[PDB]
Design an enzyme around this catalytic site. Structure first.
Site, PDB file in Angstrom:
ATOM      1  N   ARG C  46       0.857  -1.179   0.000  1.00  0.00           N
ATOM      2  CA  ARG C  46       0.000   0.000   0.000  1.00  0.00           C
ATOM      3  C   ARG C  46       0.899   1.236   0.000  1.00  0.00           C
ATOM      4  NH1 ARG C  46      -2.875  -1.217   3.981  1.00  0.00           N
ATOM      5  NH2 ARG C  46      -4.774  -1.804   2.841  1.00  0.00           N
ATOM      6  N   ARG C  70       2.240   6.657  13.364  1.00  0.00           N
ATOM      7  CA  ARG C  70       1.048   5.807  13.298  1.00  0.00           C
ATOM      8  C   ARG C  70       1.334   4.333  13.574  1.00  0.00           C
ATOM      9  NH1 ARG C  70      -0.096   9.298   8.915  1.00  0.00           N
ATOM     10  NH2 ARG C  70       0.736   7.819   7.361  1.00  0.00           N
ATOM     11  N   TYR C  91      16.550  11.539   5.177  1.00  0.00           N
ATOM     12  CA  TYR C  91      17.815  12.101   5.628  1.00  0.00           C
ATOM     13  C   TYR C  91      18.271  13.219   4.667  1.00  0.00           C
ATOM     14  CZ  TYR C  91      22.491  11.618   7.843  1.00  0.00           C
ATOM     15  OH  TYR C  91      23.676  11.781   8.531  1.00  0.00           O
ATOM     16  N   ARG C 144      23.883  24.959  14.308  1.00  0.00           N
ATOM     17  CA  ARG C 144      24.592  24.617  13.087  1.00  0.00           C
ATOM     18  C   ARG C 144      23.970  23.394  12.429  1.00  0.00           C
ATOM     19  NH1 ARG C 144      28.913  21.419  12.415  1.00  0.00           N
ATOM     20  NH2 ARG C 144      27.379  20.626  10.890  1.00  0.00           N
ATOM     21  N   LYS C 162      18.313  11.388  12.671  1.00  0.00           N
ATOM     22  CA  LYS C 162      19.474  10.589  13.088  1.00  0.00           C
ATOM     23  C   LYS C 162      19.046   9.307  13.789  1.00  0.00           C
ATOM     24  CE  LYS C 162      22.960  13.379  11.922  1.00  0.00           C
ATOM     25  NZ  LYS C 162      24.067  13.016  10.990  1.00  0.00           N
ATOM     26  N   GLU C 234      24.915  16.777  18.309  1.00  0.00           N
ATOM     27  CA  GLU C 234      24.718  16.977  16.888  1.00  0.00           C
ATOM     28  C   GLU C 234      24.374  18.413  16.504  1.00  0.00           C
ATOM     29  OE1 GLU C 234      25.197  15.217  13.419  1.00  0.00           O
ATOM     30  OE2 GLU C 234      24.352  13.717  14.792  1.00  0.00           O
ATOM     31  N   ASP C 235      25.108  18.935  15.528  1.00  0.00           N
ATOM     32  CA  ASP C 235      24.890  20.277  15.001  1.00  0.00           C
ATOM     33  C   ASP C 235      24.955  21.463  15.973  1.00  0.00           C
ATOM     34  OD1 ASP C 235      24.673  18.794  12.725  1.00  0.00           O
ATOM     35  OD2 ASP C 235      22.739  19.593  12.065  1.00  0.00           O
ATOM     36  N   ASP C 257      29.072  13.961  16.715  1.00  0.00           N
ATOM     37  CA  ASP C 257      28.940  13.381  15.379  1.00  0.00           C
ATOM     38  C   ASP C 257      29.596  14.210  14.271  1.00  0.00           C
ATOM     39  OD1 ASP C 257      27.983  11.339  13.663  1.00  0.00           O
ATOM     40  OD2 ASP C 257      26.164  12.481  13.199  1.00  0.00           O
ATOM     41  N   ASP C 258      29.597  15.522  14.449  1.00  0.00           N
ATOM     42  CA  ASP C 258      30.154  16.416  13.447  1.00  0.00           C
ATOM     43  C   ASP C 258      31.665  16.525  13.502  1.00  0.00           C
ATOM     44  OD1 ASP C 258      27.627  17.380  12.207  1.00  0.00           O
ATOM     45  OD2 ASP C 258      27.199  17.993  14.280  1.00  0.00           O
ATOM     46  N   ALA C 291      38.302  24.945   8.538  1.00  0.00           N
ATOM     47  CA  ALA C 291      39.119  24.433   9.632  1.00  0.00           C
ATOM     48  C   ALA C 291      38.338  24.410  10.939  1.00  0.00           C
ATOM     49  CB  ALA C 291      40.387  25.292   9.788  1.00  0.00           C
ATOM     50  N   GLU C 293      34.908  22.076  13.038  1.00  0.00           N
ATOM     51  CA  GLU C 293      34.555  20.773  13.580  1.00  0.00           C
ATOM     52  C   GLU C 293      35.024  19.594  12.724  1.00  0.00           C
ATOM     53  OE1 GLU C 293      30.420  20.642  14.983  1.00  0.00           O
ATOM     54  OE2 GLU C 293      30.420  22.821  15.205  1.00  0.00           O
ATOM     55  N   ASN C 400      26.817  19.664   3.593  1.00  0.00           N
ATOM     56  CA  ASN C 400      25.413  19.351   3.316  1.00  0.00           C
ATOM     57  C   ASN C 400      24.524  20.528   3.659  1.00  0.00           C
ATOM     58  OD1 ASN C 400      25.922  16.360   2.978  1.00  0.00           O
ATOM     59  ND2 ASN C 400      26.600  16.691   5.100  1.00  0.00           N
TER      60      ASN C 400
END
Ligand SMILES: Nc1ncnc2c1ncn2[C@@H]1O[C@H](COP(=O)(O)OP(=O)(O)OP(=O)(O)O)[C@@H](O)[C@H]1O
Ligand SMILES: Nc1ncnc2c1ncn2[C@@H]1O[C@H](COP(=O)(O)OP(=O)(O)OP(=O)(O)O)[C@@H](O)[C@H]1O
Ligand SMILES: Nc1ncnc2c1ncn2[C@@H]1O[C@H](COP(=O)(O)OP(=O)(O)OP(=O)(O)O)[C@@H](O)[C@H]1O
Ligand SMILES: Nc1ncnc2c1ncn2[C@@H]1O[C@H](COP(=O)(O)OP(=O)(O)OP(=O)(O)O)[C@@H](O)[C@H]1O
Ligand SMILES: Nc1ncnc2c1ncn2[C@@H]1O[C@H](COP(=O)(O)OP(=O)(O)OP(=O)(O)O)[C@@H](O)[C@H]1O
Ligand SMILES: Nc1ncnc2c1ncn2[C@@H]1O[C@H](COP(=O)(O)OP(=O)(O)OP(=O)(O)O)[C@@H](O)[C@H]1O
Ligand SMILES: O=C(O)/C=C/C(=O)O
Ligand SMILES: O=C(O)/C=C/C(=O)O
Ligand SMILES: O=C(O)/C=C/C(=O)O
Ligand SMILES: O=C(O)/C=C/C(=O)O
Ligand SMILES: [Mn+2]
Ligand SMILES: [Mn+2]
Ligand SMILES: [Mn+2]
Lengths: 552, 552, 552
Positions: C46, C70, C91, C144, C162, C234-235, C257-258, C291, C293, C400
């Site tokens: 579906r 849901r 993502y 960021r 993530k 993150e960010d 993560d960065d 120059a 993260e 990105n």
């Protein structure tokens, strides 16, 4: 709607070890209960075994009333096993003892509590009650608990006791019953200094705020559950009782148990007595000890009975006399006389009686009814006077509990040499006279009336309850007395058969309500007896298994 | 009775960012929502912004209908902002498109589903519905979904859509509405091979088991919610529709929307047209295209109106002719003629018409009503014939959705040169003729009737619904038409005012129910208008704060 | 735990029509769902059917993310069906588009929101999260977001995205994941004037109160869930990012993560490239565009790799040059040079480059890594220069989303005539040169790293994550690249096999943690591969049937 532990914490659903293996596995209870699968019969046996070893009534009351908060089904099965022996423990006289000690034996609360401090927010309190489909409410303000007086919030024990009988006697669903206590203070000085007291520490508010609170309560209750919700007023003070009755009886579905319920059971007793005495209606002379809630309620019902039997309302009212704390009610006395007492306030007799004994010797009544709630006012001399004035004197000592009764069965039967017809509000065992004769006194308590009337009014969706309904209940009650029972001295059907007796009264009252266009339940049942019997709640365990079945 | 996340998962209570700071802190929601405190106005703006960017109606239906599963209050707020532009998306014609693809767009279920495989356990299904006080149920078996035919369980979209209008139009409380789908199979071959089909994969069970199932359903619904629960039958096949109405209308509070609701709106339209044509009652000649649910319901309602205006039932019925898929209903034709059609089955005319155009030129009717649910049967020739025979022909194309309509507004107005009075079941926009005149066609859809009638019946505790109720609704609808709006070519009040029009019909109907002793809600309100308006549910957010206050 | 409707309202438990008959009957769902019993396969069909008809990526994101709210099980089943095609929608780049418009498309909130206005009450906020056993937290303050800048609370989309990958890629249990957004204001002027903004309307609080909040958050999280709860930053802005990592990495189980995740994926790419270039470690010259993260994170990881392969830390750092927004990083420049950059800040070369192209011609680097988050800075001239200087230039454009990338795959492959080894952060499809050659570029995104590392750390009960853990993850990723894929131009394993790749990385990392006495999970499993595979969460439906069985 919920599974797991909660099913066991809710006395409404908890079955203890009676939950079957499949119920346990399907409802998430496996492991939370002992491996043993029990039957309700084994549970009942465990109860009677423990009860046997107990000594005091209050100890027994705590134990069984506690079962109601643990396993509701079992609680009612327990009452049903022997309602007669448990009645004095769960109801009068022990319930009166429990109320006076309510703060000391407290463990869990029962019922809804509304205080004067909650004025303006009564509806949100009503919305907190868990059950969504209430049909019967018993409310009190604790000002007139039995003949015990003002016990404030300690009086909540009365409404809970009455509602137990709604279910045990008439099969009214417990989940549709709601005991309510209105707390506006108390004038009981002992309670105001008791650190265990459960109510507001203030004197009773007797201002308009009290009336406003009751109004808010009636509106809130009916706004949530319906305008035809049965609201039974219980143990309110003399003044407030009549005015609330008058004020609400035409706007809500309400009645006062101390005015109308007691009136109907008293009448039933007198009708039974007349069946064995056959006194010419014109020679009836009734003298009341007290002139309040019960006296006026009974008097008005006796009058309706005489009217539908020939006599005029005026001639009937002349056969009824009353004697209160100030003396005989005669025209022009210094002590007040309200609108309700007027019809029974006659012109001063030959001489004005000082004591009740004088009232008996001067008026020479054929019937004496004690409803003063003040102790042994029916002295040995008052009883001997009645025996010498009448061949078969009728002596009714209706005040509760026992200590407040006008006299005991032993005294009534002995001092009259087994010639009187006796009934009391509280229980007294059989009496054996020196000559070997045995008299079994009846209990003229409104428990014989309210369960059956409540059941009928609820099933018929009645909107308002007229006084004639209680007259009809009175007749339905006495019509069940078998001649063999009268002989023994019983003016009422055996208490052991209170369940069947209540159902029969409900059937009679339901037929009366439909016949008089007072029932609004549609369509009208053809067979009222089948209609009532099919709708009575039972104490047997129900299956809690979800409906599992294969699809074809 | 619950706090935390669950308050957000239930569309009934979820306010989104509109939960105030105090509500969030007090109900355990702090941190589960963004810091932003929004108003409903802001939430509405977000919606219209997103709706604007969407292209297809089905895409819009999925989005707004989805809001009903997230935030009920906001859902109705959105409909209320512009009912007219959203009606075609949430209701006809798009709801028809939605049903056709129900299995393809499925996300979350709505309503109760009862299947023939559940026979014997329907009560257990009814006990699973979360709401405790249902007052209105709209049920379907999906055999006659609009003019689309048999869509089986895919037809559940219809009851859901109807109940949305109950609330958006008449303010009936959403938590008291229940959409139900009865699944006993489907004859739609395409669906039985569709892997996304939501119902039983079997042909329709047309045996006694079907009737038994519907019987069990009616009983289970009323046993849990009350005997006066409004039960609206929707989109049932022709045979089952009448027999279920006849069988239950006297034992339950029920009506069929396709027979009675449609009958009422159609009549309202004719009454408005007559106000513009003023044609002598004796010269009325009505010809129906189709002779089923709608035709028979409308015919019976037209007859009642004529009788109350002079003519006898006999002579009124003679002014009505019907033409179905086998041709003109004449006495002795080879094609069946059931009990309901007999009164409108006349003796064969001079020449028996083969097509509907022949029937028009032979019978020369003054009014033509399309209720065949079979497409464009009102061909250009049929319309031109009506314009040549009548100065102001009345043409009603009531079949839904749009593709099933007998003709369009454009066709009717143009081919008659603006001389006709047109009404359709599905919406058509304004029509501008080459000469510059603009005609605004009205929508003869039962949405103008059932919301208002349902509200009145619920508020009055009506037990059964007589056909005269729909006659009164018909009159209440037409009496709201302002002469200025009739000029535009409107045979019905503007759809933009559907809310006010429904409340006005409800008031009129409630006044009618009480006046004819059909209302059992006591006491009877003095001012019926104030009575209805005070009880309409509103889409504004309620405060969910607990009642906190100090004790004096 | 729950029963009835609640099971369908909670995405975690909801199965839609996949609930079996027994399940529905035993959990009180009969009738609440259509009669049809579906399988997950049918539900998956579906979904794909609907997704095909959709046009825009944002429309697809809203639809699939709506499924997570849901039916969680179905949500992950859908990602698993084709992770490669849905990755760009759930993502990067689409998730960036979603966050920039988060307030416009909001429907339901996800994750926990902690604002500066809740300082001092952060624990009670954490106590409001429904799940009791959280093992992984991804938090952002939205300063960021990708290369998009400061998006404030609109940045919550990133932690949500993530965590989806935590589960979709490494089988980390969804109920043990918690996305968090720390709101202290935003400096984005456009958002402060947006009526749909979901955060606090105030500029960012850069005072000690910010540090307090972050500290209160770390303590609140660990206090309720445990000291070894994995906390992924993150960010966060450049300044805060480093200082929090340094401040917490030794006291909590945390990583950025960065800085570290991006470092490990880039390194893995370089290691793959070397496998096809075989360039003498002495002749390696790396030039970074930016120059911050990522550059400092990657630089440090490259260094560790060279040291572990001969070179000393000092001589390895000499092979790395960085060029930021002010120019080449050389000792004594006017632009600041922090502690972290010091090691890669060398003595000014013969001529100071003005642009990045000049830096390339002067330094003549063999590898170029774009991580400036500022658009197309790898101009055609920069690329041509690299191809002229090197035979096989390594060009990495890691910023990105797509629009912020330093160059496209098409640009890199054409301007270097297919001689470069390219890798980008955002996805680019295959490139076909005019001569017919087809090159498939790899995606150097940390999604290849954090899922596997996260799984290993959680399963091993690791207390702190050292930089060496990322070096081993980098080697683990690269050691899975088959020779045949190298040839195609792939520097990373195919995204389609990201699930197996993540699991394999987790196995290598858990073996590393145990070998280095960093894992505290006891007992230590003998076969780490079996240990990891047995504990991954699966998207297949589980049985919700209570354990029912017969007793002997
Ligand atoms: N055992 C009972 N105890 C208390 N109230 C009862 C009891 N049995 C029935 N009633 C009430 O008596 C009224 C009439 O009973 P009846 O069963 O005819 O009505 P009903 O509408 O079918 O039942 P219900 O509303 O309970 O589903 C109802 O309002 C019902 O609530
Ligand atoms: N010592 C007394 N002697 C005679 N009458 C008394 C005496 N004490 C109180 N009374 C009367 O008893 C009546 C009590 O009426 P009230 O309305 O308070 O209660 P009740 O419900 O009628 O009585 P019961 O206790 O029987 O339920 C009053 O009229 C009061 O004057
Ligand atoms: N907005 C509404 N939508 C649906 N039903 C309603 C609505 N408003 C009132 N009702 C119903 O109409 C009937 C009469 O209304 P009224 O408010 O007089 O009754 P009530 O007994 O005071 O209300 P309730 O039973 O809801 O507490 C009731 O059965 C009530 O449930
Ligand atoms: N092609 C046709 N030409 C003329 N009449 C038709 C044609 N097709 C069907 N009909 C008739 O239309 C009627 C449909 O009646 P039915 O009860 O099924 O639905 P309805 O509710 O009356 O119609 P609608 O679709 O307008 O709601 C039947 O009497 C049928 O004979
Ligand atoms: N226009 C530019 N030209 C060259 N370098 C730039 C330019 N603009 C910004 N930069 C540099 O890019 C770096 C950005 O570092 P920051 O820590 O903010 O993010 P990052 O995580 O390293 O980057 P990414 O966007 O790739 O995730 C800074 O060193 C900055 O000086
Ligand atoms: N699939 C998973 N997703 C997230 N965390 C997991 C997952 N599987 C296991 N864990 C966590 O990894 C750690 C070690 O796993 P293991 O199964 O050996 O522990 P456990 O103590 O037996 O499990 P638990 O505490 O969950 O009952 C545990 O703290 C557990 O919470
Ligand atoms: O016998 C039982 O299971 C319960 C006893 C009690 O509640 O006292
Ligand atoms: O559970 C009890 O016995 C007492 C409780 C109390 O004193 O409140
Ligand atoms: O605006 C809101 O809060 C909700 C939107 C939705 O449910 O679509
Ligand atoms: O196919 C289903 O059951 C669910 C679909 C959805 O949630 O979108
Ligand atoms: Mn009493
Ligand atoms: Mn219909
Ligand atoms: Mn990032």
């Amino acid at each position: 709607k919920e599974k797991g532990k909660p099913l066991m914490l809710n006395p409404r659903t908890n079955k203890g070890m009676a939950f079957t293996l499949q119920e346990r596995q399907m409802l998430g209870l496996q492991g939370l209960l002992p491996p043993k699968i029990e039957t309700q019969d084994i549970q009942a046996l465990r109860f009677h075994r423990n009860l046997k070893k107990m000594t005091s009534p209050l100890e027994k009351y705590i134990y069984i009333m506690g079962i109601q908060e643990r396993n509701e089904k079992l609680f009612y099965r327990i009452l049903q096993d022997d309602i007669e022996s448990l009645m004095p423990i769960v109801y009068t006289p022990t319930v009166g003892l429990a109320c006076s000690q309510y703060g000391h034996i407290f463990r869990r609360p029962k019922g809804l509590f509304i205080s004067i401090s909650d004025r303006g927010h009564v509806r949100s309190i009503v919305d907190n009650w868990p059950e969504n489909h209430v049909k019967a409410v018993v409310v009190t303000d604790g000002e007139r608990i039995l003949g015990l007086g003002d016990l404030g919030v300690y009086g909540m024990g009365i409404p809970v006791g009455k509602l137990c009988l709604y279910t045990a006697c008439a099969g009214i669903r417990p989940d549709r019953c709601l005991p309510v206590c209105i707390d506006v203070g108390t004038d009981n000085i002992a309670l105001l200094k008791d650190p265990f007291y459960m109510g507001l520490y203030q004197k009773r508010d007797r201002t308009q705020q009290y009336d406003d609170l009751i109004d808010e309560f009636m509106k809130a209750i009916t706004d949530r559950y319906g305008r035809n919700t049965l609201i039974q007023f219980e143990d309110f003070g003399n003044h407030n009782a009549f005015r609330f009755l008058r004020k609400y009886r035409e706007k809500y579905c309400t009645f006062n148990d101390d005015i109308q319920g007691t009136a109907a059971v008293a009448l039933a007793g007198l009708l039974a007595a007349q069946k064995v005495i056959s006194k010419p209606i014109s020679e009836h002379k009734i003298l009341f000890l007290g002139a309040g809630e019960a006296a006026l309620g009974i008097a008005n019902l006796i009058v309706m009975s005489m009217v539908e039997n020939g006599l005029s309302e005026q001639e009937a009212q002349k056969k009824i006399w009353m004697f209160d704390k100030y003396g005989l009610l005669v025209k022009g006395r210094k002590a007040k006389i309200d609108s309700y007492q007027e019809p029974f306030t006659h012109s001063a007799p030959e001489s004005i009686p000082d004591t009740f004994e004088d009232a008996v010797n001067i008026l020479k009544p054929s019937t004496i009814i004690g409803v003063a709630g003040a102790g042994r006012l029916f002295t040995p001399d008052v009883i001997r006077a009645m025996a010498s004035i009448n061949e078969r004197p009728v002596i009714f000592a209706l005040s509760n509990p026992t200590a407040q009764a006008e006299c005991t069965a032993e005294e009534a039967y002995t001092l009259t040499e087994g010639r009187c017809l006796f009934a009391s509000g509280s229980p007294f065992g059989p009496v054996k006279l020196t000559d070997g004769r045995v008299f079994t006194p009846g209990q003229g308590n409104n428990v014989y009336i309210f369960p059956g009337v409540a059941l009928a009014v609820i099933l018929c969706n009645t909107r308002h309850i007229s006084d004639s309904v209680f007259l009809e209940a009175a007749k339905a009650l006495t019509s069940q007395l078998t001649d063999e029972e009268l002989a023994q001295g019983r003016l009422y059907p055996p208490l052991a058969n209170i369940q069947e007796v209540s159902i029969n009264i409900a059937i009679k009252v339901t037929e009366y309500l439909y016949a008089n266009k007072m029932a609004f339940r549609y369509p009208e049942p053809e067979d009222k007896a089948k209609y009532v019997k099919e709708r009575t709640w039972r104490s047997e365990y129900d299956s809690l298994l979800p409906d599992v079945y294969e699809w074809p």
